Symmetry: D2
């Protein structure tokens, strides 16, 4: 029965705020402890801490900065299990899923070890008569990052690694569903040799977010979450003159061509759709088999795989997928499911009544699969963020491609085929950020960049990779000339 | 009297609103010509033009795209000083200041000839077993630009040359004070073999601006102009979900260190201070000597040099500067130098007396040099944007430095010193985007980035150079794998 | 009628007193002579280049770029004139000559971007108050040897990057078709390149040697036979110079059973028989994978070869023309014979061809061999003539071993609709340039060109960014200050 | 006493060859041990080892390789002390100077953890109609490194880290004068998870060197050492069709301008001139004082500081200098010194007649300092590679600069001054690879590149940095199109 506060200046720290938010264990439904919710006062403190520390960290040379991360990765590996447990205990996802989650953040840390090279600027000589021209990439000062429940390990790291490594000081306002991991991360960071103040964790709600966007000393805000909040966070951030990147929702389609490997496809779909209980910005929502036989045979492969999915709490190491995050979330899922039924879709596998003995209060829904889904339906238009697979049947390639093309969401997409032509055209044309050819969850590695299109992002630079070093950095340009002395 | 409309589908086109705005000859104060003020209909038509036109352009390989700009460059060079009389007649700046203004723009178009190199994306083999991962940069679709009166040749090019090279289509909403130049450029692109629709020009005021900010097919907005307005244009752009870059205005300082070549500095102060009437995002607006001595000899250098400035119409090539742009602007300068006296500053060169014979209704105002400027004064805090040079005296280096540091503006800053250390320390810490060491207008060239810091910039990407390419493209990343096929 | 050299901005006759003949390969007989060059002739050119290079090095990258712009102007304005001189000397078609000129016009296009292409890296604060950056400065003076077949394209390949980097260039072209290189150098003065910067010296092995050992030359690039490459690279490196050399080729096309047979077949006809196949990137070996697909391949190949319109460059309707030299005609008629001697079956016999009015010109009918073996000399030596060899392969792994196992690695192609076969292939293959559903996969000027295995020596490619690497040398500066007036 | 052979296929292994070579302790002149000298059957075994091990390593993904190097780095910090002991014992420099050795190489290992991003290639979409074009950087295959005595840790890591991270196999033939360290680095790399076969140390003679240079399955050769030996290793490699980069000798000059902080110049000269007995390719051989009021005052600060030098064995942690590497190395330095007196030089500090109580017979030489040296002298022309720093008095900036300009060697050069103009002019014009402004030893860090000009380097790619990634990979360029197939 724990109380989590903030982490400001190198210490776990309770707020001055009266307010406190309670953390559930989603597998039992029960309250497990609480999160300090920051007040404007608490937030102002965080910035001050950041302000004081940042000049000197800026002044630490790139190689030294990177060695902090090299120790941080070592530390992370060391705490693989302990970090993975608190994460699974608060979020619901299997231990393996949490480890995967943390491994992915680690990988951006590995990437940022290369900051000395990643941060070099361009030089030119003889731009004029005796005139040299060169740029420098300097810190932006202080930055804030806002994080969702879905990844309370990987997405903070995604942002604070490149921001910190760049010489910035960073403030993380994470989700108050699972706030344990972000705080452990800040602690290990100092244990790795980060100065106090450089990475602060502040917990809270809309108040805290709003305090971040209005706060004059924070230059850059980074957001991942839902599209209506992202649109808000982006806009509000821009009004207060900050730079901003925001990443929102998804309704990700997997097109299956008649010539694809249906077995690989089927297996990919089962993992991509139901893994982590569908609770993912990069999960496959909608399968689009092309043609009647492909759609019949795909279904036939998939329903016994869905029915046999193993559902349990994180303490059950055999479980394929766990409980969803909250009772709010479970019910929203349940509502969508029944509307799928009301609108004429065929629920070929019905996980509505699954009940796990000794865990009745836990937020458990068995996996669900819909067939004959069409674009009018809400199960189509809406991101469900729950264990629900929609099969939409396409007559052909052109018809198939229209579906992801025309959806307001454009985060990830996958086409499954042997035909190079089919793949190149599709991956070429589709108005989506991240395209998987015979790959289901096409999330780029740390040294590339992640970002959707259309309604799934806002701004002009992605997350991690080369783009991130642009976001956390501002460019000085120097024009240099000399008169004769000696 | 001439009638300018918009430029849509490769054609000069009249507005559909009856709304019009006046274009003056700043030298003579009179009114030659008229600009159509775009309706929402007019704007909608430029967008529908662009929306039809771009895919096939997006589909032209980058080498063929490069070739348009190649030819376009030759075309400007052919129409160089037929294009410059145009600029000078509407704006007031001399044929040499227009000449460069266009040249600078033309350089962006030379930079963008290398779009095939420039637009390359990154590949990786075996990020995973059997697995390849690689980026591609694609057009964002349809972008738009809003440009101020000072530079109607250059800044449009800044925006549209990189936009269009990347495979996009563009709409330009220029300043209507001086809108001949923008339409001609659009007309020259056709002649260079640019598909119709890809570059549209739309004149208008705020109503057009808002029409752009809110149009759902316009993906990216680029703006240069006043700070307050930029801040508004940034905000709205974001609320409407677009990506956006905006660059505000300045109060650029120069720091003269004791050891500096006081001749070389004093010279550069006149030309950067008063050239183009002081009407620049990047002109020198404060002079900061370090020490009483340095001050004194500089003031003694400048005054005859300010006095002996030839002021007149673009039509006299002798002239070192000319008319301020509009009567509305010239009065806000006049009033600002008045607060210069009320506020305790000692004015040393007084150019309000100036009337160019017969030109009494021209927007002529001579040179103004102030001394003993304090931080408190309006004249120091506010962007005069006129032929008014303020001189602030600092006892030491650390204080000389404190001045541009503490200021709300932060586009440019120069330091004049023979000391390697003074120059490295200073350029290192100063929180200004463009930094000049012994150079008065540290404007980067087309292959570098342009952008100020603090309140002279909004957003995270800069103007021209590598950044523009990043701004006018969006990343796609492909992760790729195969199932064992006919090979086995 | 009599070509000499082009030294220091105007054509000059040589002191050597020696000459090479220039045949018109259509008629067969001589039409003009080129000066061979002495050491004094060669030395006078290095002295021009030494005089002009520092002031050329001085001019900024923008002004340097502008010369190339205007040189692309003029190159278009003389397209016609140029491809005419090239054709009557080389024997390549007027349309083929046009391609030759354009393919190097496009390198010139590339180097118009040298301002950005020459940028250096800068670090700030890599130690306390210590910066470090680099500058890419001119090598000094370059040299280039070009073979007979591309007197337009390959000289430009070399000298355009070399000269844009601020260097001076000495070109020693082929004394077979030498008019184009002078005209090119002459046209460069017209664009406003200083004199002495681009000088053509003509000659044989005697001139190569005088270049290979001249102390003021730093870099050397060569294309030609592997044996000459070998030695030029060998000799350069011994004289302490830096070298890039490119050699011979035996380029296979592998047609998979699922390829688009028409498209393929059509391609063999272009790439095997274009310009009588006088090319480092021509296709020489067809490797059908099916028994059935080798059968149909031939079925649609034979009428294609047979109906090849052969004619002198003056027949603008001809596909092909004369080989460059009486000597070459003999080499190839010798190789066609060993084919028949060694078991291969000539299914189109071209030896028989004589062209009315041009009976002594080096014309030779297309030759298609079948049941070719990898033990045969038509397979392992480079014909450089109008002769395509078809090697029957039973399977993919067996087909793939042919290009892999061959001493040459210039180009390769695979024709298939299977994304799998194409990627695995391009992935593993031994060869620098790989075409998938593409016959002659020469990379564009912004990319770079080079063979692997025996087809290239050194570590940098032609054109692209590699070319800027070769004509440049890095300086690195570490900079810092004592306390003073600050 | 000990016996070292080779590391081949994950193991310490004896050489099948008859021949062996002596390892001395330069402090005492004793023989501590013996290296085996490789025969061609010993090298061949190593090459087949690499041949078998390389494909699978190249098949491991960039992230997974970087990880090995990440581990290696922790292992270096773990064994820092054992390693410096072993190094210093054989070679003779301080434990402190050996720590540098390892750390300067360990930082190449850091640089390379980032290979996933470093090995990206370039992608281009629709280079033609429906044709994408892109390159892959696959490995070169099997490489080799031949390293001198002075840095038997730093310079192997220089070559093998880039090489291995690029998924290549490596063969290291280090200096047989101090071979304990490399084999340990090879062992340590096995601990880090590098597969057997991937890092092989082969110890040997010119017989080893030739064997490497003539082996059909080695694709690439890096060499550091003599200019004459560089030229040979370069020329031979090339005639066997390998690619090569060779790095040679040095005569590093330091120019002191009158406005320089002499206290600092002087202190720098102590470290850079004498540290590690001056057995560095980046050590300062020539002090070039500009003006005589400078020249006189430099010597005035310079003389006590030399004579104060503590000279001792690696075992005396207090010592600034150890012995030189061999009996032979000493005989030339003593010989060359006498040449100085013989030709005119003024020996203001005499190190000749100094031995050490208990360490007579160990190769010790007191620091020597010449004044009034000129370019005709031998101590100016030759690389001394011992504790002998020449002073050449230049009358002016221009004359001072001609000194390095004109020299056979162009490895490194420093200039010391407060003047921005002199720093820039010098750094720019000079024909030297690495340049220092108020920096004594301008060796770039691992993320930049190392390499001198003129006689000091060969080939067209430097050491470490993005250069080295380019040396250890070949480019393959794919051009891709598809025929309309199963899609509608």
């Amino acid at each position: 029965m724990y109380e989590l506060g903030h982490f400001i200046d190198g210490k776990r720290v309770a707020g001055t705020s009266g307010r406190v938010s309670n953390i559930f264990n989603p597998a039992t439904g029960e309250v497990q402890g609480t999160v300090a919710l920051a007040s404007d006062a608490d937030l102002a403190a965080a910035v001050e801490s950041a302000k004081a520390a940042q000049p000197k960290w800026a002044a630490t040379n790139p190689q030294r900065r990177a060695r902090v991360f090299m120790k941080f990765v070592q530390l992370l590996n060391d705490n693989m299990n302990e970090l993975a447990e608190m994460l699974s205990r608060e979020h619901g996802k299997t231990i393996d899923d949490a480890k995967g989650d943390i491994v992915r953040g680690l990988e951006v840390c590995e990437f940022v070890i290369g900051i000395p090279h990643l941060q070099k600027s361009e030089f030119t000589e003889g731009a004029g008569p005796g005139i040299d021209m060169y740029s420098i990439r300097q810190p932006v000062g202080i930055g804030a990052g806002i994080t969702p429940f879905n990844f309370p390990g990987m997405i903070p790291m995604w942002m604070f690694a490149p921001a910190i490594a760049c010489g910035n000081a960073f403030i993380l306002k994470p989700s108050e569903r699972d706030p344990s991991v972000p705080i452990r991360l800040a602690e290990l960071m100092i244990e790795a040799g980060l100065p106090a103040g450089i990475l602060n964790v502040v917990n809270g709600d809309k108040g805290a977010v709003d305090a971040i966007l209005t706060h004059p000393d924070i230059a850059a805000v980074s957001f991942v979450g839902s599209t209506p909040i992202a649109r808000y966070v982006y806009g509000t951030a821009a009004m207060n003159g900050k730079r901003a990147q925001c990443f929102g929702g998804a309704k990700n389609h997997m097109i299956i061509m008649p010539d694809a490997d249906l077995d690989q496809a089927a297996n990919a779909l089962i993992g991509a759709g139901y893994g982590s209980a569908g609770e993912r910005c990069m999960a496959i929502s909608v399968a689009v088999p092309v043609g009647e036989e492909t759609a019949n045979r795909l279904i036939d492969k998939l329903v016994p795989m869905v029915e046999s999915l193993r559902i349990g709490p994180y303490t059950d190491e055999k479980a394929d997928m766990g409980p969803v995050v909250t009772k709010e979330a479970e019910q929203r899922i349940r509502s969508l499911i029944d509307s799928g039924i009301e609108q004429g879709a065929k629920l070929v596998v019905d996980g509505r009544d699954f009940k796990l003995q000794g865990y009745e209060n836990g937020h458990f829904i068995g996996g669900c699969l819909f067939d004959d889904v069409t674009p009018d339906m809400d199960i189509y238009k809406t991101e469900i963020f729950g264990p629900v697979l929609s099969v939409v049947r396409a007559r052909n390639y052109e018809e198939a491609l229209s579906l992801p093309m025309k959806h307001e969401y454009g985060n990830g997409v996958a086409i499954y085929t042997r035909d190079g032509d089919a793949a190149r055209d599709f991956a070429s044309r589709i108005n989506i950020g991240m395209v998987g050819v015979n790959v289901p969850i096409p999330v780029p590695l740390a040294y590339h960049s992640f970002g959707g299109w259309k309604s799934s992002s806002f701004g002009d630079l992605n997350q991690h990779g080369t783009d991130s070093i642009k976001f956390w950095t501002r460019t000085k340009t120097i024009t240099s000339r000399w008169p004769s002395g000696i």
